[PDB]
């Protein structure tokens with residue numbers, strides 16, 4: 001019952017820290033999670049949110065959703081078939097996703113069996129004391145102890161959970177957790193929220209809806225995807241609309257009731273109403289701190305609710321660290337993994353390393369998708385006296401032939417115009433998530449715009465647009481947008 | 487008529503050079519090409535090989551070919567439709583391709599009409615003297631003179647042309663040029679060659695083949711795609727085979743005759759026989775210098791027929807330059823364009839610049855495709871004492887579900903293990919040509935493996951594999967492979 005490291009949460013960050021500590025530094029590791037495989041009741045399980053009810057199944061389902069566009073687009077290239085015979089079998093998709101997620105769950109079980117020092121414990125981890133984690137039967141702190149784990153080092157890696165707004169009839173609504181297990185594809189669905197999860201699910205439901213279906217996405221403010229490039233926010237909005245999704249901006253559910261046929265009657269704050277089969281809330285995710293009983297050792301939380309951490313993932317309590325979504329910063333898997341890898345290389349490697357929270361590449365698997373790294377221009381413009389924006393936006397040739405004329409590719413480079421340093425790169429279109437990864441490496445290397453334009457293009461690709469931009473489209477001078485410099 | 491620059495060949499490199507010299511440096515520029523729009527009889531035309539019978543139309547046709555996989559793969563994600571209704575209409579693909587290419591032809595026509603100091607001349611350009619380009623009716627130097635252009639500076643930018651082996655029945659075979667104009671998709675086709683053109687057309691013809699059809703690729707050597715990463719050469723062979731293409735390595739055509747039904751009877755050196763509807767020779771491209779009458783001026787050619795150039799694209803004759811395929815080096819459009827821009831900056835801008843032919847990102851639009859930049863490990867191992875290989879190879883999850891379990895993604899990083907400098911990056915799988923572009927920028931910035939593995943991944947992507955490799959798979963020490 002004695003460990004160098006006890007990790008609460010067998011997720012993206014938890015397993016990276018766990019595995020590394022064991023395989024690289026031959027350390028003695030305990031990892032706690034509430035479930036060994038995906039789905040109800042606790043949804044996240046061994047592997048974490050990403051594996052079970054996040055990046056992995058979502059990406060399989062977006063890939064499934066993309067075939068609605070490929071089947072149509074094929075016609076431009078001479079593919080002929082009976083379009084009246086086309087059906088999207090959601091039940092197939094969910095069964096194939098479940099098998100793929102289960103195989104990963106089994107994979108992690110394999111990893112824990114086949115690794116000296118690395119041991120998995122089932123149940124609910126909380127903090128007894130500075131150096132003891134208790135595993136109980138349930139999330140109730142009164143439930144039975146299954147284990148008392150002695151820890152020289154404790155890692156909090158419990159991730160996040162969907163926020164459900166406290167409106168009348170919220171019990172008629174689901175989150176992404178339940179979206180992954182719907183037995184039938186909804187004919188009419190309201191996705192609530194303007195972030196990546198609402199956007200990605202609107203695309204998924206749009207592809208799998210039965211005949212006479214309608215996807216509506218509502219967002220409480222004016223323009224979806226706050227924090228992304230503004231040109232891309234506007235374009236994603238147009239491209240989702242072009243593919244049949246209704247975007248209701250400046251709208252927010254005030255209440256939901258069940259109609260007598262089991263459908264949902266949504267009343268908006270504005271007084272508008274909408275009948276749907278599913279209401280999926282995707283308005284936020286909040287760190288999972290309640291169940292850890294952090295009051296028992298006095299781990300400090302932020303005004304927001306995340307575990308407060310320094311640059312080395314250290315809480316206010318020596319030997320207690322926190323990575324990933326529990327810190328309520330950038331809620332992405334590779335960030336959690338990076339923080340985990342750094343924490344272990346630091347503490348057990350004697351090789352201190354801090355995660356860089358700048359210049360993080362990320363994606364939205366919207367149809368079509370977003371790839372982005374670094375600052376949007378409005379943010380750059382407040383930090384840098386002179387910012388240049390390089391922009392290329394056009395419908396690629398393939399999509400003129402496919403008939404998807406609305407699929408404008410957007411490539412934007414934001415620079416410090418004083419030295420040419422690239423501050424951010426913002427892509428919308430097929431392949432954007434793949435294109436952006438090596439751009440993340442470019443930004444780590446302090447690439448300038450001249451490093452891009454002096455590189456020889458790969459032709460023909462969308463990516464070569466990033467190496468063809470020599471002249472700013474416009475600038476910000478002391479925060480002020482203008483076409484030309486003074 | 488008198489010009490600062492005369493460009494023979496209105497192609498990738500010629501147009502970059504002409505447009506830059508006219509617009510950036512205010513020079514009076516003439517550009518010569520044999521045809522104003524794509525296709526027979528001369529195939530290349532205004533815009534060049536890439537526009538007319540190269541990168542642009544081939545990428546559209548590979549995109550078309552990819553739908554065979556998407557339609558099949560859709561089933562794993564629950565898509566249902568009547569498979570027996572599926573037809574690949576090649577006529578529609580060719581029509582869509584022709585319209586796209588002709589629009590580009592027309593836009594280039596409009597660029598010349600609307601750019602003052604940039605003039606287009608139709609016909610066959612050759613050298614009369616070191617400062618005179620003659621434009622004639624035909625490739626025959628006795629054909630009628632249309633123009634004589636006085637030139638301070640002459641750029642040779644005539645590209646390359648398919649190589650056809652001098653075998654009996656060569657006349658019954660075609661090249662890529664004719665493949666772009668086949669009115670009907672061949673039921674049985676043999677692509678001859680192991681290079682990108684053979685492999686890309688094998689995938690195109692494999693998707694559009696009518697029922698009961700068969701695509702065969704033959705190559706003289708043991709393993710297609712020499713010059714590419716060896717793991718990728720092996721895997722792309724497996725993945726082509728898995729999609730129904732017959733790869734005949736260590737085989738070469740000895741002759742072709744017509745069966746009585748007009749189909750092609752191929753006899754290989756090995757005494758194997760194959761009956762096909764089309765034989766497409768893709769064994770090589772040779773520099774197009776014959777028609778230039780370079781003997782009029784004494785421009786030095788290689789025995790192969792390439793124009794010899796220094797690093798600044800200068801021939802042995804002052805004021806005569808050559809860029810692009812005619813130089814018989816790296817036969818890529820972006821390289822031709824880079825060389826044209828560097829030449830004009832140097833000559834007209836006094837901004838001396840030479841093209842870097844190292845660490846050039848390129849792609850093969852095979853199905854699935856290749857993206858590469860920099861050295862393969864066998865080459866690195868001869869130039870560096872210690873070389874590390876970081877390799878990740880696995881069927882991605884979407885392809886377990888899709889039913890294309892054969893589709894392994896390969897990601898390989900080759901380093902100088904002495905300092906970690908990345909020497910090469912080699913990718914096989916969907917997205918590879920898009921992933922490799924920004925890797926080009928990384929290699930220009932002398933990125934080390936640590937710069938890749940300390941970059942935060944984008945998940946889920948194939949690209950994130952590049953940023954997830956901490957530990958070498960194997961090494962070369964003084965040219966020798968060590969596990």
Ligand SMILES: Cc1cc2nc3c(=O)[nH]c(=O)nc-3n(C[C@H](O)[C@H](O)[C@H](O)COP(=O)(O)OP(=O)(O)OC[C@H]3O[C@@H](n4cnc5c(N)ncnc54)[C@H](O)[C@@H]3O)c2cc1C
Nearest residue numbers: 009011012013033048049054055125159324325331332333
């Ligand atoms: C729908 C969706 C889509 C997403 N898509 C992407 C994407 O494409 N790319 C991306 O990078 N990120 C994506 N994310 C975010 C990603 O899932 C998270 O950022 C990441 O999983 C956070 O990792 P973590 O280590 O913080 O915790 P998690 O991976 O969430 O692991 C936490 C684990 O802790 C366990 N746990 C919690 N409380 C306790 C307790 N008291 N005792 C024991 N175990 C406990 C849970 O069961 C869970 O398995 C997505 C998220 C969602 C919900």
Ligand SMILES: Cc1cc2nc3c(=O)[nH]c(=O)nc-3n(C[C@H](O)[C@H](O)[C@H](O)COP(=O)(O)OP(=O)(O)OC[C@H]3O[C@@H](n4cnc5c(N)ncnc54)[C@H](O)[C@@H]3O)c2cc1C
Nearest residue numbers: 495497498499519534535540541611645810811817818819
């Ligand atoms: C099937 C195929 C696929 C390819 N795919 C790709 C790819 O995906 N990516 C890539 O980067 N590269 C690709 N390439 C290579 C690319 O097309 C060439 O590298 C590029 O076009 C060479 O440019 P250039 O300026 O040297 O000549 P070109 O673009 O070939 O232009 C030469 C021009 O000169 C004209 N001409 C010739 N002789 C005369 C004369 N005497 N007088 C007047 N005009 C003349 C021709 O009509 C032609 O238009 C491909 C090539 C082929 C054949």
Ligand SMILES: COC(=O)[C@@H]1C[C@@H](O)CN1C(=O)c1ccco1
Nearest residue numbers: 196227228329330331362363364
């Ligand atoms: C693509 O990842 C996201 O959408 C992340 C995850 C969560 O932290 C919310 N979020 C953002 O707001 C955002 C803006 C730009 C990039 O990310």
Ligand SMILES: COC(=O)[C@@H]1C[C@@H](O)CN1C(=O)c1ccco1
Nearest residue numbers: 682712713815816817848849850
């Ligand atoms: C995609 O780029 C290529 O395929 C280029 C184009 C042409 O130059 C041949 N080639 C090679 O790289 C090569 C080396 C040895 C055999 O082919």
Ligand SMILES: [Br-]
Nearest residue numbers: 707708709712
């Ligand atoms: Br070989």
Ligand SMILES: [Mg+2]
Nearest residue numbers: 112115118119
């Ligand atoms: Mg174990």
Ligand SMILES: [Mg+2]
Nearest residue numbers: 598601602604
């Ligand atoms: Mg003109």
